Design an enzyme around this catalytic site. Structure first.
Site, mmCIF file in Angstrom:
data_model
loop_
_atom_site.group_PDB
_atom_site.id
_atom_site.type_symbol
_atom_site.label_atom_id
_atom_site.label_comp_id
_atom_site.label_asym_id
_atom_site.label_seq_id
_atom_site.Cartn_x
_atom_site.Cartn_y
_atom_site.Cartn_z
ATOM 1 N N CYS B 108 0.788 -1.215 0.000
ATOM 2 C CA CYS B 108 0.000 0.000 0.000
ATOM 3 C C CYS B 108 0.825 1.270 0.000
ATOM 4 O O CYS B 108 1.495 1.587 0.999
ATOM 5 C CB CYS B 108 -1.058 0.022 1.122
ATOM 6 S SG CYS B 108 -2.043 1.522 1.068
ATOM 7 N N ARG B 111 -0.171 4.732 2.623
ATOM 8 C CA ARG B 111 -0.141 4.515 4.090
ATOM 9 C C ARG B 111 0.143 5.751 4.952
ATOM 10 O O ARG B 111 -0.061 5.695 6.129
ATOM 11 C CB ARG B 111 0.794 3.371 4.487
ATOM 12 C CG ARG B 111 0.169 1.994 4.224
ATOM 13 C CD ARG B 111 1.168 0.887 4.474
ATOM 14 N NE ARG B 111 2.261 0.807 3.515
ATOM 15 C CZ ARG B 111 3.376 0.122 3.705
ATOM 16 N NH1 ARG B 111 3.618 -0.491 4.885
ATOM 17 N NH2 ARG B 111 4.271 0.059 2.715
ATOM 18 N N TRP B 280 -9.376 6.199 -1.373
ATOM 19 C CA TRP B 280 -9.612 6.914 -2.636
ATOM 20 C C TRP B 280 -8.579 6.442 -3.658
ATOM 21 O O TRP B 280 -7.548 5.871 -3.291
ATOM 22 C CB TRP B 280 -9.556 8.429 -2.472
ATOM 23 C CG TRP B 280 -8.331 8.971 -1.756
ATOM 24 C CD1 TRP B 280 -7.084 9.215 -2.298
ATOM 25 C CD2 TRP B 280 -8.251 9.346 -0.381
ATOM 26 N NE1 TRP B 280 -6.247 9.740 -1.326
ATOM 27 C CE2 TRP B 280 -6.938 9.817 -0.143
ATOM 28 C CE3 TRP B 280 -9.172 9.344 0.679
ATOM 29 C CZ2 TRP B 280 -6.523 10.282 1.120
ATOM 30 C CZ3 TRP B 280 -8.757 9.805 1.935
ATOM 31 C CH2 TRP B 280 -7.445 10.268 2.138
ATOM 32 N N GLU B 285 -4.470 3.548 -11.129
ATOM 33 C CA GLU B 285 -5.271 2.328 -10.947
ATOM 34 C C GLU B 285 -6.343 2.233 -12.031
ATOM 35 O O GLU B 285 -6.546 1.140 -12.585
ATOM 36 C CB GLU B 285 -5.966 2.287 -9.592
ATOM 37 C CG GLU B 285 -4.960 2.220 -8.449
ATOM 38 C CD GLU B 285 -5.653 2.219 -7.096
ATOM 39 O OE1 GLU B 285 -6.191 1.143 -6.724
ATOM 40 O OE2 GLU B 285 -5.651 3.255 -6.396
HETATM 41 C C1 HEM Z 1 -6.525 6.452 1.390
HETATM 42 C C2 HEM Z 1 -6.195 6.264 0.106
HETATM 43 C C3 HEM Z 1 -5.446 5.064 -0.342
HETATM 44 C C4 HEM Z 1 -4.661 5.009 -1.456
HETATM 45 C C5 HEM Z 1 -4.364 6.134 -2.433
HETATM 46 C C6 HEM Z 1 -4.136 3.682 -1.551
HETATM 47 C C7 HEM Z 1 -3.303 3.279 -2.609
HETATM 48 C C8 HEM Z 1 -3.139 1.920 -2.861
HETATM 49 C C9 HEM Z 1 -2.839 1.356 -4.140
HETATM 50 C C10 HEM Z 1 -2.583 2.101 -5.415
HETATM 51 C C11 HEM Z 1 -2.737 0.011 -3.973
HETATM 52 C C12 HEM Z 1 -2.418 -1.034 -5.025
HETATM 53 C C13 HEM Z 1 -3.759 -1.352 -5.720
HETATM 54 C C14 HEM Z 1 -3.603 -2.346 -6.854
HETATM 55 O O1 HEM Z 1 -2.735 -2.203 -7.744
HETATM 56 O O2 HEM Z 1 -4.360 -3.331 -6.913
HETATM 57 C C15 HEM Z 1 -3.028 -0.277 -2.618
HETATM 58 C C16 HEM Z 1 -2.992 -1.565 -2.102
HETATM 59 C C17 HEM Z 1 -3.489 -1.840 -0.818
HETATM 60 N N1 HEM Z 1 -3.896 -0.946 0.126
HETATM 61 FE FE1 HEM Z 1 -4.159 0.937 -0.152
HETATM 62 N N2 HEM Z 1 -4.523 2.957 -0.488
HETATM 63 C C18 HEM Z 1 -5.392 3.687 0.256
HETATM 64 C C19 HEM Z 1 -6.108 3.290 1.398
HETATM 65 C C20 HEM Z 1 -6.106 2.008 1.964
HETATM 66 C C21 HEM Z 1 -6.902 1.612 3.048
HETATM 67 C C22 HEM Z 1 -7.925 2.489 3.748
HETATM 68 C C23 HEM Z 1 -6.544 0.308 3.335
HETATM 69 C C24 HEM Z 1 -7.060 -0.592 4.409
HETATM 70 C C25 HEM Z 1 -7.560 -0.145 5.577
HETATM 71 C C26 HEM Z 1 -5.562 -0.102 2.379
HETATM 72 C C27 HEM Z 1 -4.907 -1.338 2.335
HETATM 73 C C28 HEM Z 1 -4.301 -1.731 1.152
HETATM 74 C C29 HEM Z 1 -3.984 -3.150 0.929
HETATM 75 C C30 HEM Z 1 -4.188 -4.310 1.916
HETATM 76 C C31 HEM Z 1 -3.456 -3.219 -0.300
HETATM 77 C C32 HEM Z 1 -2.960 -4.498 -1.023
HETATM 78 C C33 HEM Z 1 -4.169 -5.036 -1.834
HETATM 79 C C34 HEM Z 1 -3.936 -6.358 -2.538
HETATM 80 O O3 HEM Z 1 -3.025 -7.146 -2.212
HETATM 81 O O4 HEM Z 1 -4.705 -6.672 -3.502
HETATM 82 N N3 HEM Z 1 -5.250 0.969 1.610
HETATM 83 N N4 HEM Z 1 -3.194 0.911 -1.894
HETATM 84 C C1 LIG Z 2 -8.632 0.638 -0.244
HETATM 85 C C2 LIG Z 2 -7.953 0.828 -1.589
HETATM 86 C C3 LIG Z 2 -7.636 2.092 -2.101
HETATM 87 C C4 LIG Z 2 -6.995 2.153 -3.347
HETATM 88 N N1 LIG Z 2 -6.666 3.314 -3.957
HETATM 89 N N2 LIG Z 2 -6.740 1.005 -4.029
HETATM 90 C C5 LIG Z 2 -6.988 -0.236 -3.533
HETATM 91 C C6 LIG Z 2 -6.632 -1.512 -4.334
HETATM 92 O O1 LIG Z 2 -7.754 -1.928 -5.117
HETATM 93 C C7 LIG Z 2 -7.468 -2.942 -6.117
HETATM 94 C C8 LIG Z 2 -7.327 -4.393 -5.626
HETATM 95 N N3 LIG Z 2 -6.087 -4.509 -4.886
HETATM 96 C C9 LIG Z 2 -7.287 -5.436 -6.767
HETATM 97 C C10 LIG Z 2 -8.662 -5.675 -7.417
HETATM 98 O O2 LIG Z 2 -6.717 -6.678 -6.273
HETATM 99 C C11 LIG Z 2 -5.878 -7.371 -7.212
HETATM 100 C C12 LIG Z 2 -5.335 -8.659 -6.611
HETATM 101 C C13 LIG Z 2 -5.454 -9.868 -7.301
HETATM 102 C C14 LIG Z 2 -4.947 -11.047 -6.735
HETATM 103 C C15 LIG Z 2 -5.074 -12.366 -7.468
HETATM 104 C C16 LIG Z 2 -4.317 -11.002 -5.483
HETATM 105 C C17 LIG Z 2 -4.211 -9.773 -4.810
HETATM 106 N N4 LIG Z 2 -3.602 -9.709 -3.579
HETATM 107 N N5 LIG Z 2 -4.730 -8.653 -5.401
HETATM 108 C C18 LIG Z 2 -7.637 -0.318 -2.315
#
Ligand code: HEM
Ligand SMILES: Cc1cc(N)nc(COC[C@H](N)[C@H](C)OCc2cc(C)cc(N)n2)c1
Ligand code: HEM
Ligand SMILES: Cc1cc(N)nc(COC[C@H](N)[C@H](C)OCc2cc(C)cc(N)n2)c1
Ligand SMILES: C[C@H](O)[C@H](O)[C@H]1CNc2nc(N)[nH]c(=O)c2N1
Ligand SMILES: C[C@H](O)[C@H](O)[C@H]1CNc2nc(N)[nH]c(=O)c2N1
Ligand SMILES: [Zn+2]
Lengths: 407, 411
Positions: B108, B111, B280, B285
């Site tokens: 993330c 953060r 947001w 993305e």
């Molecule tokens: C506040 C604005 C936020 C922004 C701009 C942001 C930005 C991002 C982005 C760009 C990703 C990668 C998404 C992707 O390529 O699939 C991500 C992943 C993630 N973020 Fe955030 N984030 C935000 C808030 C949060 C919040 C509120 C949480 C949880 C409480 C969170 C937990 C995560 C987690 C767990 C991932 C990994 C997701 C996965 O493995 O699929 N984030 N974040």
């Molecule tokens: C809370 C939040 C804010 C923000 N700006 N972006 C996000 C991420 O949303 C996208 C999701 N991570 C996507 C759909 O997950 C892809 C994915 C696929 C697979 C197979 C595994 C994995 N960990 N993650 C989440």
């Protein structure tokens, strides 16, 4: 123990078994991944020689043959007698090609079997090194139709008689700190430049001064040589649409030639093994030109483009990046100097990976390095899972000689 | 042990000690790095150390470590585990845990915001209808008419693994995808399988390019149930370009609220299998991945066509050119409609400041470079040049298998 890699765009899964042969360590543990870190005697030598000769004789479908056994015998005899051994020409060539094949950070490996190997193990002096290098430069350059090559100087002995090319690449530009506080030329090479001046080089003091070679033979103090200007092919950078682009007065050299790495084959160490291919456009247009610590030209270009530089969200940096990279490719192509764009190169690498999985059971790849520094996810490598592991023969980083050298 | 990371642009070096507190595995070994691999019922026995480790971290954070309150709470949890085989978190602990799972989320980039997270405690929920109401309320609060607020809703924890709460949707808001008989896809190809499940369960599909999917909600291990999110709660942005007037005619739009609903929240050994969370968007993305992946909306060709770029050779960088224009359009459109969004320059710059702060106050910041570096213009963002250490801290968000692959259908 048998491992799967998936392509998330195509759903194709490949099975890696080649990793079980990996010998060296990665920097990672079960508790911590170091994937993004840039730099993470007789008894020792015979196992390394054996491992190598086994893979060599295997490669020529003569594993377990008398010629196989006889060579192990011979090398064994020789290590016991002389504490080192010499590679046959065939083995040196095989080893150099495989070092490239095993280079996990190289997107260009589809080409690995077409490598011209120049045996410079008879070299004894720095002047001889200069001669070998000019010949490599001229052969590889080939009037713009670039050809992959490596030149291999004598192997490490007791380690006090190392051959080294002090330069990081055969061809690179000087860097100069200014009274101004700014940097003239390439900021990456400021220190090496000072070493050259302190050793005698008369610097022209320009923005694109090709550095002299600083060559070390037989553990001797390194000496300076200038590459004949006429063998250093350069390209003026212009843009197909923006007539003002040429006024920035940018150019780059055609030949990328890494000269600071160490080639390890069957336990032997070749500390001077300059090697060269051809550029992928992003190396020059994205990194050399746009890194903040490099030529850092983004601001100047964006201004000439009349972009709104007020807010990051107008993506003015991104717009100017694309144009600089269009200009690099167009300039090389117009002058008929071999170059590959990042789309073509990465597509090639995916095909190479499939060949390697099919024919070898895998391909070590470092995703952090393979994915291009612009437009990552629109290239197929972004979506390809990669396993990174270390196979020998290999190219290894080694410390800069000026930290090691006793003068 | 101390581990150093270097920034290759600034030469700034940081020292990580936080990694000493890491317990879970990475997938890597001394012989293989699995850094680009996407995916690399507890006993009393395993549970009390996990509970104790969490409560120690919690009581340290409030400067009450080893107090009577800390000791009594350990005692109270211990007796609860041995007697019921599990335990309940206090509201304060739940809030702390949810915030820390975000703080610990190494993929993330957002953060810097981790301490501002609205936590909705839905542990009194018992039915799918109850879950629907909680999720609607989350959407409305988080949306806040465009002024987005981070939030998480936490449904009852796992008990025996037979009574799980799950949101079957991967995101609360996502568009349907429909495979056509001729092999083409209408809508989002990422959601074809889930769309087929919805249809099977009785959803009447509009069969257009941007149909908001229904929620499919499982309470207490029962068969999931369909609900439509009220359309008035689903904020969307039509996509237009500041200079190219034809961009609007591509018919593109996207939703404002990124809300992940398929992950598992682990706090003190407890497992929250339904814990939808939202923030947001970072513009890439949508502009890079959702619009330009070949496997998603795949609009690069059409855009480049309309821009009249030379498409006969990749070396004209036509894809790169179209890509930048699309991303300008996304940012422009969201900003114009006053819906919160961040560009990849701002976001990565903020992440580096966050990471340095974490190094100073906390001793580290686990970060996954492969995910943190944006999918366009990688090296003109500061994170490209930043060495990172990836390791797993708890509390954490974890992947879990899609529920249709594991659900025991009741009928
Ligand atoms: C506040 C604005 C936020 C922004 C701009 C942001 C930005 C991002 C982005 C760009 C990703 C990668 C998404 C992707 O390529 O699939 C991500 C992943 C993630 N973020 Fe955030 N984030 C935000 C808030 C949060 C919040 C509120 C949480 C949880 C409480 C969170 C937990 C995560 C987690 C767990 C991932 C990994 C997701 C996965 O493995 O699929 N984030 N974040
Ligand atoms: C809370 C939040 C804010 C923000 N700006 N972006 C996000 C991420 O949303 C996208 C999701 N991570 C996507 C759909 O997950 C892809 C994915 C696929 C697979 C197979 C595994 C994995 N960990 N993650 C989440
Ligand atoms: C023929 C065309 C070639 C192309 C297009 C190419 C492409 C690349 C690129 C783009 C990089 C990343 C460079 C960087 O970011 O600094 C790289 C790294 C590398 N390639 Fe190649 N390559 C080519 C030939 C070769 C050859 C001939 C060899 C050796 C014989 C080689 C061995 C390496 C090694 C060892 C690295 C890692 C270097 C390091 O760690 O700094 N490549 N390759
Ligand atoms: C042979 C070849 C072909 C091609 N197209 N491109 C290249 C790129 O060579 C440039 C070098 N890799 C640069 C200078 O190395 C960066 C570097 C820095 C550090 C600290 C360590 C390391 N291993 N590598 C080499
Ligand atoms: C810290 C990070 O490892 C470093 O910036 C890397 C990232 N990927 C790279 N990739 C390539 N091809 N070349 C590089 O120099 C780098 N630098
Ligand atoms: C195979 C590779 O790990 C995969 O494509 C990753 C790369 N980096 C990513 N980074 C982010 N933020 N999101 C992703 O989905 C991915 N995909
Ligand atoms: Zn690793």
């Amino acid at each position: 123990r048998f491992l799967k890699v998936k392509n998330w765009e195509t759903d194709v899964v490949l099975t890696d078994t080649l990793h079980l042969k990996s010998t060296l360590e990665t920097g990672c543990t079960e508790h911590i991944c170091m994937g993004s870190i840039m730099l993470p005697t007789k008894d020792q030598l015979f196992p390394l020689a054996k491992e190598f000769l086994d893979q060599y004789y295997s490669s020529i479908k003569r594993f377990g043959s008398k010629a196989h056994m006889d060579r192990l015998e011979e090398v064994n005899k020789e290590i016991e007698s002389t504490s080192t051994y010499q590679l046959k020409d065939t083995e040196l060539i095989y080893g150099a090609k495989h070092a490239w094949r095993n280079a996990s950070r190289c997107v260009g490996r589809i080409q690995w079997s077409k490598l011209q190997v120049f045996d410079a193990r008879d070299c004894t002096t720095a002047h001889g090194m200069f001669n070998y290098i000019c010949n490599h430069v001229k052969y590889a350059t080939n009037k713009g139709n670039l050809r992959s090559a490596i030149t291999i100087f004598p192997q490490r002995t007791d380690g006090k008689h190392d051959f080294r090319v002090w330069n990081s690449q055969l061809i690179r530009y000087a860097g100069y700190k200014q009274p101004d506080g700014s940097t003239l030329g390439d900021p990456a090479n400021v220190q090496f430049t000072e070493i050259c001046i302190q050793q005698g080089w008369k610097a022209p003091r320009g923005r694109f001064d090709v550095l002299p070679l600083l060559l070390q033979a037989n553990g001797n103090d390194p000496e300076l040589f200038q590459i004949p200007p006429e063998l250093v092919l350069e390209v003026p950078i212009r843009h197909p649409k923006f007539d003002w682009f040429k006024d920035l007065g940018l150019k780059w050299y055609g030949l990328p030639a890494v000269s600071n790495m160490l080639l390890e084959i069957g336990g032997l160490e070749f500390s001077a093994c300059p090697f060269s291919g051809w550029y992928m456009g992003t190396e020059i247009g994205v990194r050399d030109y746009c890194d903040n610590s490099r030529y850092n030209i983004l601001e100047e270009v964006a201004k000439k483009m009349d972009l709104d530089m007020r807010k990051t969200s107008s993506l003015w940096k991104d717009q100017a990046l694309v144009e600089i990279n269009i200009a690099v490719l167009y300039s090389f192509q117009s002058d008929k100097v071999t170059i590959v764009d990042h789309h073509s190169a990465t597509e090639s690498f995916i095909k190479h990976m499939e060949n390697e999985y099919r024919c070898r059971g895998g391909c070590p790849a470092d995703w952090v390095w393979i994915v291009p520094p612009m437009s990552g996810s629109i290239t197929p490598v972004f979506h390809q899972e990669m396993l990174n592991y270390r196979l020998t023969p290999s190219f290894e980083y080694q410390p800069d000689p000026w930290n090691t050298h006793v003068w």
